[PDB]
């Protein structure tokens, strides 16, 4: 019995990055369509985001960067040369028809979601378009142009004393951990995969620099981590973070990019694992903000996210997929839950124990709230 | 991780004096296209949508938006079903066939597909492509 | 230890002992002819030899000397079926340890070695017969590695007779070949281009008075295999921006053709050829996890599982010794040199991490010898946190998983391309000088090439093709050397010419 | 390794068998001294018959290859024992002899007569490893008859160090003048009164050996006494630490010789030649000027590390610093050094695998970096067992293909040719790097340190229950662990013992 809102503009799945690029925003639409057939939209306040004007996109990012994103187009690429080689935009984050409207849309949804969230209207705020956690203050990085999460948290810090951030994605949210690397109001807990891997940062030793020391949890993992291990390491650490830090609002970046088989994955989770994660985080009775970001096998992202929204509400949903518009994309079984693969996990228990004890040792040194 | 002035975000420090009055200085951001209701039983909604698909061209969503357009009154929306139409953006013979020529003599450079479908933009080309790969 | 007390008593073991006895015998023995006690006379020569070194080296002389016969403590011995020009090499081997092997007088030594139970020289004459196995002496080396009970040289001498059965049907040796041998060369997988049906029928029609009711189980045992005579050229065409994946199906000899094409929208940071299937790795973006798999009979790209690491200029090695694609070394995202080994079970689409290298390299030329991956040169971590051209040799052992740098180094250094051939590793780098590397003997031999710039090696089936990158049209931009005569000829027929070779695979 | 160009692996090349020397070695080892076949010559020792081969005896030695080629009987050797020539045969054939202290000197004779080079050299190493005051003036004579410089020095150091204890024996009585000149004219410490022992030697004959007497008193090099075994220890409530020195007495007794409480905070320290160099805010260095009490200043480190290992090298007159943590818990592997006089730190090659808190010990050149703790899986550290030799001259560091019988934090003491390692209790390993082996002892019974004064191994218990005198004197020949004293200090928790 908890009110749930949902942000989705029927126009985000038309922005196409390039030919042969891992991120295809179309997955959002597919997710939407499943939510339109499971029966999970009768009972969820559906909104439409506002096109985020470039005057709130500046309260974090620099001005020349936003002017660059607003003034670039694949026809006049030759005119802006040193500009695009200085803002990283061009090779990993390609220019494409749209771009700044995509950023307006994701950022508008996330920021508006926080604005409604801190006014004690709804309790859970869903937005699977935003959550771009690699973008930085004056440059793009890792498929991400603007950093929706830091704008949403900059919006939440107007009414809340302390804000928690949770990273489930395979990668290290280095943009939102960097943006809050000195302050101690926001605490960034990030479970990731640290070996030689994107983005490279995210060690166990880099914590906080300045006032916000001991206020940045990085949990480095290894390949092939199955579900039971990820639960046994997710529950205690987050109970300790809730006990020691005492937040007021939670921002979950439920990245569906750590499942069984992605174009770019490496773990070995399943959908019910992420479901248990979002249910555990949901069971603290705090203003919660679910985001997206990450996930490059489209059908598994749609399945994962639609079962996530099935967890946010309360309703159980069957395995059989009802008639949508994309059966030609879902495999020859037409079932929701996927199964793990054959990959073995190289994090041998006592690894998780030593890391976890290091984390507890770093968490017992926070002052009272 | 980098530390400096142009790397981190400038967090505003906390003064409780502003946790009350701003609650109306920034209104609701975004349209409200649908909201649940306790009065209308979802059986009449299942019938409403089944009629909106069988007896009319609406789908599994525009029936809900149009139902909210009249403040949860089924009969009025039923009265306004023949008025508005589900805009049939019909890609006719020349449209689909020329699109197949662009996709068979070009690929996924929709900017080039635009150089033989100059009337349509790009969002409708991409929207038609994902709904076209089914063949 | 518990009783050995270095101030009371202990067991001094001298480990420089084995060389002082050997260099004692090869210098005091075969020089001053001192202390001789047996005379081995062969085809008219008296040899003043010792019984202690001949017996401590070959059990044949151990059983011939310590015997109950009459010629035990007499003196002169007269050996039979051996010449006085081979037994001198046997003396130069027993007393010294260094023999000068030549392809002229080889089989004889082989035979004689097997009669004297000199195991090491027999194994090296067997490997050196496995190298120089022609198409003419392929039914005589087969018939020779059979009366000596040798499975290695029999398999090597049978593969060539199998993959050259077309131009072997009319030879008068293939008509006298007995039933077991033909059963072995047929029941193995003769290609369709080698038309085996009319080969067996051509065999039966000889002494059919006694062979008709004796050669039908042969036809019930005939097989057929696909085509693994490929090159797989991957280079960026001068026209568009995508890179083709040309497949070169070589004919019989002195001609290479072209099968089909595929192209790819992505870039490539590494690529390998596993069992006739193509495996490319990398993406034009900054997530170079991705990996694809191509084949001439699908014109598709069956995506495979992504790597667990983001490295470029790493080293993909293959060879189905146990079905796995290895990725050794590489240069990371922040321009650091990694030294981690990850492998890929092709039958499972699963990557796994094994023991790491001892020196981090990037761009090393890897070559798999029957279950051992060799990392050759590449690029090494300098000292001022820079890089430098490397000379190292590394020997990852894909059976016990244990790599270790070889003590010696290469002649040249830097960016090199190498291909395995028969038993050796042909390496090319700084312009025009290919060295053939023998990892068993730990030695090199140069060869020199035309003076007219990079080069790429691909040992196709029987020969060694040498493709030069910059197709400047004027040059014949493709060669073919015979490693026994160093005769660099010119082969033609590239048809769909490229312009910038990135990878020339096996 | 050589890129030959005359030979071709497909036409003509040269074969080079690697397992040849071995195969012939175990060939002669096997079918000779087991079945006794092809017996050639017969050698008679005392009254025992030895059926031996001429090719092996001629291969190993030159005495025999010159005896057999003298251009047909049982040749008899007239000055060897029946039980020593057996060791000589078991060495010439098998190459693995069982040494022993009772029939050692005998071998030193015969192994030189037969010109067995390796057995003579190692017999010399094991003969100079166990020279005591009882037999130094005889091992000098033995080293002088056979023209051995290495063992003459090791036999002369013990003779001039303990000079007062010998000035009234009898081996010192009939001593030739050349040996005495070699003893006194190299640096006799003043603690044994060299001036009186000269005239004491003169009165043994008085009338004859007096022609050079006055000129013999103008030949010695009397030198002041140094200092042994530093104890930088933390005693009493705070008060920093100390720097207690221990003047050694040749009476099974150690003595204190002035403290030096002037300390701040120490991370590491080492003893060079005869003074203390200390490092400890974390990259400085002071010197212990004990003659004038005061410390002194030196150059700082080019970097900053924690728990690094300082190894003193009097050969090159330098100090190497190896390994250690770098503030943040990441293990480093950078070897630096400090030249005394030039007073400028520099840099050398890096270690193979990084390690911190190890125990370094140099053997006349090569520095052995023992134990420590190496990083593991995946961010942390584990107690290692690795052995590393850092060749101080060629600048080559490489790991030994074997590990210790224990792991963790340990303390080592160079003694003679051996390295006495000790660690976490009921253990005392005696590592010999030349022939690559370990020999464990047994100790009475808590970490404890080890130190080598001159001819004994003083082992120190670094923790007291106040009133126990846990400063054991270890004689490793008989594993005799005694309890010495004479120390008059209340030093409680001592950090480390600088030998
Ligand atoms: O599974 P693959 O053989 O690697 O093919 C994929 C897959 O295409 P299919 O429709 O044939 O499965 C992607 O489709 P979705 O997973 O997104 O449905 C498609 O992406 P888009 O068509 O949506 O762009 C992508 O194409 P691209 O590489 O151009 O992004 C294409 O890859 P290939 O080009 O390797 O076939
Ligand atoms: Zn991700």
Numbering used by the authors:
A (entry chain C): 8 to 376
B (entry chain D): 1 to 135
C (entry chain B): 26 to 477, 483 to 536
D (entry chain A): 23 to 93, 99 to 307, 312 to 476, 483 to 536
What wording appears in the published article?
Here we establish that KBTBD4 mutations promote CoREST degradation through engaging HDAC1/2 as the direct target of the mutant substrate receptor. Cryo-electron microscopy analysis of two distinct KBTBD4 cancer mutants bound to LSD1–HDAC1–CoREST reveals that a KBTBD4 homodimer asymmetrically engages HDAC1 with two KELCH-repeat β-propeller domains. The interface between HDAC1 and one of the KBTBD4 β-propellers is stabilized by the medulloblastoma mutations, which insert a bulky side chain into the HDAC1 active site pocket.
To elucidate the mechanism by which double insertions enable high-affinity engagement of the LHC complex, we determined the cryo-electron microscopy (cryo-EM) structures of two LHC-bound KBTBD4 MB mutants, KBTBD4-PR and KBTBD4-TTYML. We chose KBTBD4-TTYML in addition to KBTBD4-PR mutant because it lacks a basic residue in the 2b-2c loop. The KBTBD4 dimer is well resolved in both structures, which were determined at 3.42 and 3.30 Å resolution for the PR and TTYML mutants, respectively. In KBTBD4-TTYML, the mutant 2b-2c loop in β-propeller-A is solvent-exposed and structurally disordered.
